[PDB]
Design a binder for this molecule. Structure first.
Ligand SMILES: COc1ccsc1C(=O)O
Ligand SMILES: COc1ccsc1C(=O)O
Ligand SMILES: COc1ccsc1C(=O)O
Ligand SMILES: COc1ccsc1C(=O)O
Ligand SMILES: COc1ccsc1C(=O)O
Ligand SMILES: COc1ccsc1C(=O)O
Length: 147
């Protein structure tokens, strides 16, 4: 079987299967490898006008739309996956979370502490894996599980 959240799917690329995780929104060509009491994650948050607090250290008033936020997230993911930029450099420069100053590190946490969509994605990632866009009331996240 595939690990939690993962499904094999048909891409629209010359009949090639890919794998998609409906908990983390990760997608990849490769079959995924393979739950802990705690995980350690970093994240990059992009807030939008419908965030719980449309404000960050980067911008006193966050006015971008949710759609615009998702396009930003998608672009960061593209740059991370291509190697053009590192997750940590992008989090430090562009995350609307205060954790940006710590390269997005949130430390370790248990189930029952974080916003549930964030928690669920985090615990479905294996160490070293990165999520796709994860939506919470804070905004849209890229999550990297580091331990
Ligand atoms: C719109 O693009 C999609 C959607 C499902 S798979 C796929 C692809 O391009 O491989
Ligand atoms: C406790 O070990 C497990 C089980 C699935 S994920 C995972 C991990 O720690 O990466
Ligand atoms: C294309 O539409 C999108 C995309 C992300 S959010 C959103 C909306 O309509 O709010
Ligand atoms: C979660 O928030 C964090 C994490 C590291 S720094 C910081 C802050 O708020 O200053
Ligand atoms: C408690 O919720 C927090 C705090 C920092 S990030 C975050 C999340 O759910 O991702
Ligand atoms: C996070 O997005 C939210 C939350 C409350 S309403 C809303 C929206 O997109 O309109």
């Amino acid at each position: 079987k595939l690990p939690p959240g993962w499904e094999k799917a048909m891409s629209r690329s010359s009949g090639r299967v890919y794998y998609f995780n409906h908990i983390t929104n990760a997608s990849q060509w490769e079959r995924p490898s393979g739950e802990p009491a705690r995980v350690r994650c970093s994240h990059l948050l992009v807030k939008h006008s419908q965030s719980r607090r449309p404000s960050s250290w980067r911008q006193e008033k966050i006015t971008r739309t949710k759609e615009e936020a998702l396009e930003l997230i998608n672009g960061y993911i593209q740059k991370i996956k291509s190697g053009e930029e590192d997750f940590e450099s992008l989090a430090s420069q562009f995350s609307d979370c205060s954790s940006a100053k710590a390269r997005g590190d949130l430390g370790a946490f248990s189930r029952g502490q974080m916003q549930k969509p964030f928690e669920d994605a985090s615990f479905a990632l294996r160490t070293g894996e990165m999520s796709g866009p994860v939506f919470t009331d804070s905004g849209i996240h890229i999550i990297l599980r580091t331990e």
